[PDB]
Amino acid sequence: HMLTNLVAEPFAKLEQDFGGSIGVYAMDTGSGATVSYRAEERFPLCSSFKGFLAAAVLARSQQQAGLLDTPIRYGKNALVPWSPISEKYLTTGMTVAELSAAAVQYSDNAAANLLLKELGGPAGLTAFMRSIGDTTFRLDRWIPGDARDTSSPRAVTESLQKLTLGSALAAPQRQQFVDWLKGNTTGNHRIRAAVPADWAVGDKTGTCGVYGTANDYAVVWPTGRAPIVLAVYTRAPNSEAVIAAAARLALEGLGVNG
C-alpha cells in the first residue's frame, strides 16, 4: 500500500468525460510502485482472454512434444465473424502455433475457439490461470454486471507479469509469448499510443461490441529501466482514445517520462 498511488492522477475526471467505467492497474517492476483505479473491480474480458490462452498453449507445449507444429484443419462452420487470418487458411489448415499467433496478433475469433478446444474449454483456461495463482480470472463461455467472462485489471496485470517476466513459463516459451505480444497489430490506438516508439511493447486488446466496452494489457520496456506491466479495462456508457489517455495517466503516476 505504501507504494500505491504515490502520485494522484485525474482518473475520475477522465471516467466522467467517458461516461462509463474505467479500471487501471500499472506496476513498475523495478520499484514495486503501482497505480490503481478500480483495479479490483470486474470488467468484461472480451478478447483479452486470448493472450492468456496462448500462454496456456505454450505451457502445455512444455509437456506435449509437437503441440505447436500440429496441423489443425477446420470447417467453414468454425469461421465466426472477425476471423481475418483463419478464413484465409480454411482450405489448408493452420498449425497450433499459427492459430495462437493469429488469436494474439489479429484477435482472430475462430482461431481462439479452436485453441480453447485444445485446452478443454473455458474451464481449462481458467484452471491454467488458477495454476499460476490467479484466483480472479473467470472464463465461462465458449445481464447487467454479469460476472461471467471477467477479471480485474489488477489480476490481469499480475498474471501478465508472471507469464512474461516471471517464472510461470519456461524461458523459451516465455520469449515466444513476449514475441507474440510484441507483434500484435490491433493495439496501435490503445496503450501503444501512450508509449514512445523507441520502447518495446507487447499487448493484447479486447473489444466487446461497438459501445465502448474495450480493454488492453501490455508489457512495456522503457529504455534504461525496468519494465512496466499494465492493464486498462472499460465498461461502456449506457474508448480507444480513453484507453490511451488512461495509459498516459498511469505512466505519469509511475513517474515514467515518455
Ligand SMILES: *C(=O)[C@@H](NC(=O)/C(=N\OC(C)(C)C(=O)O)c1csc(N)n1)[C@@H]1N=C(C(=O)O)C(=C)CS1
Ligand atoms: C475480441 O474482443 C473480439 N471481439 C468481438 O468478437 C466482439 N465484437 O467485435 C466487434 C467487431 C467489435 C462487434 O461489434 O461484433 C464481441 C462482442 S461481445 C464479446 N464477448 N465479443 C475481436 N477482438 C478485437 C480486439 O480489440 O482485440 C476487435 C477489435 C473485435 S473482434
